[PDB]
């Protein structure tokens, strides 16, 4: 009863502390640490957290980042249906973020363009041309402002031109960091309670 | 080949008109701003290569365009057609914050101005319910903006267009203030095309 209220409070503190450390690892390109921290958070989810809309946003972000971090591994499946590559799965999470964070198409569009682009190109690098075409056609926009990129890609899949500048100039690292940038902007900048108490406590000590 | 040359020229062209768009906006020549804005809109579909400088210029251009049409509540800049121009400008400001990697402190005062204008303009045009929604959606989470919103709420509740807050609101001052904030994040360089024109003016 009370013991569960108290556990809830701690669990949320734990969750927020690790989320903060997960973003820091991600920002520092320490993806190994990111994944391990991600697993700790995954384990905490079966426990009572209560309600904060702060954690749902928190969790939607982790969700998207987790899929983006494993984006270059087409052996991974974050979904019921094996079909979905991690990035395709990231697109779906982004759509959930749009709806839940009540964001406009214009705001989510830039992010999305980057994820769709990355999804197609990673498939192309693995010469999963057929898969790249399907992803391109279902997701890719046909906007007048993206039609050239879409045509280049469609053509690259055509000739299987893995040597095309579009493919060679693609930086997954930059892609990842830009995505973190965007997702990060829908979160508060505060220091999680535990890190605060850890900075205090840690300086009780000395010498 | 002659197709990487296009990308280079499209950039000079885009940066030239950007320079003239700001000049116009800064002179309150909004008619000229709009005409120039449309040239830039047509250019967007053409290959511009990618350059951090043009990506920032059109975010600013996007913000200014919504602000310039801020009083036309009949204009829709978004798929979600219920969004008023200034509401759209708020979002562009958020994308600018994110993309220009600006701190909240740097952006917050400017965002407040746009939110305030969005509600007040709606009020002056008698769109009371809309003003109410914008106020509730954008000004309720800010403790730093308490007596402005409770004042606006009562203004909306009593339909007091005569209230000093509404009567003394200057949209011109707002526009110019927004330009100054936006310009503060841009290079000062004279566009290449204007430089060459001034030169061609030497001899002839």
């Amino acid at each position: 009863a009370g013991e569960a209220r108290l556990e809830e409070a701690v669990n949320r503190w734990v969750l927020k502390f690790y989320f903060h450390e997960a973003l820091r690892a991600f920002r520092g390109s320490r993806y190994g640490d990111f994944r391990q921290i991600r697993d700790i958070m995954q384990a905490l989810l079966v426990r009572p957290l209560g309600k904060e809309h702060t954690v749902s946003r928190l969790l939607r972000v982790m969700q998207c980042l987790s899929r983006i971090e494993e984006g270059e591994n087409l052996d991974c499946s974050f979904d019921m249906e094996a079909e979905l590559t991690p990035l395709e799965s990231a697109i779906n999470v982004l759509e959930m973020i749009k709806t839940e964070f009540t964001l406009t198409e214009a705001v989510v569009e830039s992010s999305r363009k980057l994820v769709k682009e990355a999804a197609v190109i990673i498939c192309i690098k693995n010469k999963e041309f057929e898969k790249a075409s399907k992803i391109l056609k279902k997701h890719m926009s046909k906007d007048p402002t993206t039609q050239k990129l879409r045509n280049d890609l469609l053509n690259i899949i055509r000739e299987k031109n893995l040597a095309h500048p579009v493919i060679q100039n693609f930086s997954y690292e930059t892609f990842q960091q830009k995505m973190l940038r965007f997702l990060e902007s829908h979160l508060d900048d505060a220091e999680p309670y535990l890190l605060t108490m850890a900075k205090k406590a840690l300086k009780s000590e000395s010498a | 080949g002659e197709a990487r040359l296009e990308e280079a020229v499209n950039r000079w062209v885009l940066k030239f008109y950007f320079h003239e768009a700001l000049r116009a906006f800064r002179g309150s020549r909004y008619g000229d701003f709009r005409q120039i804005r449309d040239i830039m809109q047509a250019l967007l579909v053409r290959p511009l290569g990618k350059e951090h400088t043009v990506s920032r210029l059109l975010r600013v251009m996007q913000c200014l365009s919504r602000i310039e049409e801020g009083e036309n509540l009949d204009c829709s800049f978004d798929m979600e057609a219920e969004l008023t121009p200034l509401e759209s400008a708020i979002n562009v400001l958020e994308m600018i914050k994110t993309e220009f990697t600006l701190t909240e402190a740097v952006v917050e005062s400017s965002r407040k101005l746009v939110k305030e204008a969005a509600v007040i303009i709606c009020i002056k045009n008698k769109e009371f319910e809309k003003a109410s929604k914008i106020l509730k959606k954008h000004m309720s989470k800010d403790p730093t903006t308490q007596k402005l919103r409770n004042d606006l709420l009562n203004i909306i509740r009593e339909k007091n267009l005569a209230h000093p807050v509404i009567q003394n609101f200057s949209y011109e001052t707002f526009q110019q203030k927004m330009l100054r904030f936006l310009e503060s994040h841009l290079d000062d360089a004279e566009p290449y095309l204007l430089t060459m024109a001034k030169k061609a003016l030497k001899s002839e």
Binding site: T145 | L44, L73, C75, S76, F77, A81, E127, E129
Partner: peptide, 15 residues
């Protein structure tokens, strides 16, 4: 759509 110009019209709700 890094659209600079309006996409269309909005239905004012004035009166």
């Amino acid at each position: 759509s890094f659209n600079l110009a309006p996409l269309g019209r909005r239905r004012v709700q004035s009166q």
